[PDB]
Amino acid sequence: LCRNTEEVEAILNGDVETLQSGDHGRPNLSRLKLAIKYEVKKFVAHPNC
Amino acid sequence: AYMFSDRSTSLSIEEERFLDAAEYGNIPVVRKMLEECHSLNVNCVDYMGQNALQLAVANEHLEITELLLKKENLSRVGDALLLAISKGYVRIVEAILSHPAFAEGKRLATQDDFYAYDEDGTRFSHDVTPIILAAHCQEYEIVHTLLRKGARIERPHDYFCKCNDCNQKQKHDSFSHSRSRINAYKGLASPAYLSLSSEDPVMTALELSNELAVLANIEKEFKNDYKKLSMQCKDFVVGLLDLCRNTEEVEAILNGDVETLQSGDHGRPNLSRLKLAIKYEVKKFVAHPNCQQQLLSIWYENLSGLRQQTMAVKFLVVLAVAIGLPFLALIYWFAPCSKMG
Amino acid sequence: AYMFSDRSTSLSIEEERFLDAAEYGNIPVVRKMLEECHSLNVNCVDYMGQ
Amino acid sequence: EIEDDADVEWKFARAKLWFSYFEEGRTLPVPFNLVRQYQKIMKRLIKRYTTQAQIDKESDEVNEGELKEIKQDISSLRYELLEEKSQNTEDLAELIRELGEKL
Amino acid sequence: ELKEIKQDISSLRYELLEEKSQNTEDLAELIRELGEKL
Amino acid sequence: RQYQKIMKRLIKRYTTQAQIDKESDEVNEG
C-alpha cells in the first residue's frame, strides 16, 4: 500500500536523511540486505522492490 | 512508551457525546445538538481522524447524513462521497450529490485538498475520481447516475507519449504515473462502464482487450494486471453472447449491423467480427455453442446428409475423392455451377 | 457522450416520491397517494424500466 | 490446465482450421492449383446483461460489514422509537396536567 | 436475503413512525378541542 | 521529520485496509 516514490523509499530504505547515501547516486541498500539475510522473500519479490 | 496518537489531544464531553450519537444512529440527540448548541465544532474529530459525517456515512445513517449536510461549513464532503461510492450506498450518494459543491457536475471527473480524509492524505489514490471508483466497484446505478451528470473516464495516452503533459508527469514521479495509467485502465475495463458508456460495447471491449494485451507485453512490469483486465474484457463479450435467445440476437452479437455490412460471397453471413475475435484470441467467444452452431452451418454448407453420418462413412468418401480426383478436377474446370460443382 | 437512457425523460416530484415510497416500503405514503391523488399514473416508470 | 480450457483450446483450433477453408481462394487441391433494429437489439441485450449482473452480485456471499449495517439500522430504529414514545408521553402529560389544575 | 431483511426493517420503521405520529396528532386535536371548553 | 510523517500516513492506511479486510470476512452464527 505505497503510492509515491517517497513512500516506497521509506519502506524499502530507512530514514534517507539520517543514512549514508551510498557510493553513487543509487540509494542506501542496508535494509534490503537485511531482508535477504532474514529470507523475507515476498518483500524482495514484490514489484515495488 | 509510544502510541500512534492520530489526534494528540482529548475531546470534550459535548464532543464525544455528539460523535457517539453520530456514529451509533442517535438522530434526536444529533438534531438537538445541531439546533440548540452553539459552542460545538461540527468538524470535531475522533481518536482515529474521522469527523461526524464520516462516521454517519461509514455506518449507513441516511438521516444523520441529510441532517449534517445543511450546515454549510462541513469538511470532508468529497471523502464522504468516495466512501459512500466504495461502500455501495446509493441513497447516501444521491444525498451527497445534492450538496452545493457538485452542482453542475464540477468535481466528478478529471491539489485543492477536496478529497482528503485527514490532515495529510486521501483515502484512495489522487487520480481516483468518483466515476473511476464507481466503475472499479461495479456499482451500476451509481455509474448510470454519474454518466447522467456528464462524467467520463479520460482514456490514457500511449506508452511512448512525449507531450507537454506526459513528460512533466513522468519526470515528477515515475511510480504514480504508472499507477494512474493502470487505475484508468481498470476503470475503463469494467462491465459496469462498458455496458453503459458506449453505443456498441462488443467492438469497444474487443479493441480494449487487444490494447491491454499489447500493453501487457510493452510493460514487462505489472503484467499480471493487464492480463487480468484483458481477460475480463473478453469475459464481458462472452457473457453478452450467452444471454441470447433469438437468431437475430445471435447474429447481432456474432456479426455487426447486418443492414450496413456486405452480405458476403454467398448466402452465408458476414464473418468480419469472428475473424477479429480469432485475431484477438477470444477463445470462449468462438468456443461458445451459439457460435459453434453458426460455424457448423457455414462449414457444412449444402451437405446436410453427411452431417449426421458416422466416421466410418467419412473415410469412404475421402477414399472416393482419392480415387476420382481428376474427375472432380475436370468437372470443376469445365462445368462449374452444377449439382456437384 | 452516450448513455443507456432506458426512459429518455425526467420524472415529476409526485412520481419520484411515489416510486421511492413503493421501493423502500413507505406504506402510508403509498396509501395516501393512492387514495388522495388523481393526477398520478400508477404505471410511472423508473430510470431502468420498472 | 482446467477441465473447460482443454476443450476450449481444441474448439478454437478447429475453428481456425474452419476459417482456413471459408476463403474462396484455394478452391482446388494442391496438384491442380498450378493451372434501426441493431440499436434496439443492443439496448435489449444490454438491459438483460445489467439485470443478470445484479442477480449475480445478489448471489454473492454475505460478509460481516453488511450485517453491521443491519445492526446499525436496528440501533437507529431503537433510538427513534424510544425518543418518540418519550416525547409523546411527556408532551401529552404537561397539557393534561395543565387541564388537571383547572378543576 | 439480507437485503430482504433490511427492507423488512425499513418498512417496519415507516409504519411505526407514522403510527406514533397519527396517534399523537389525532389525540392532540380532540384534547385541545376539549381544552378550549374551559 | 518527513520519515515519521510518511510512516504515520502508511500506518493509518494499513489500519484502515485491515479493518476493510476483516469486514470482508464471512459471517458466522454468533
Residue numbers in the entry:
A (entry chain D): 335 to 383
B (entry chain A): 85 to 194, 203 to 433
C (entry chain B): 85 to 134
D (entry chain A): 733 to 767, 853 to 920
E (entry chain B): 883 to 920
F (entry chain D): 853 to 882
Please give the exact wording used by the authors of the publication that reports this structure.
The mammalian TRPC subfamily consists of seven transmembrane proteins (TRPC1-7) that have been proposed to form non-selective cation channels in various cell types. In this study, we present two high-resolution cryo-EM structures of antagonist- and agonist-bound human TRPC6 in lipidic nanodiscs.
Furthermore, because TRPC6 V867T/L868T, like WT, responded to both AM-0883 and OAG but exhibited much higher channel activity than WT, the double mutant appeared to be an ideal variant for us to investigate the more activated state of TRPC6. We found a clear non-protein density at each subunit interface that represents the agonist AM-0883, which consists of a chloro-indole, a piperidine and a benzodioxin, and occupies a groove between S6 of one subunit and the pore helix of the adjacent subunit. The agonist forms hydrophobic interactions with Phe675 and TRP680 on the pore helix and Tyr705, Val706 and Val710 on S6. Notably, the AM-0883-binding site faces membrane lipids and is occupied by one of the outer leaflet lipids in the antagonist-bound structure, and therefore constitutes a likely location for DAG-binding at the outer leaflet. Because S6 is tightly packed against S1-S4 of the adjacent subunit, the movement of S6 is accompanied by a concurrent tilting and downward movement of S1-S4 as well as the S4-S5 linker.
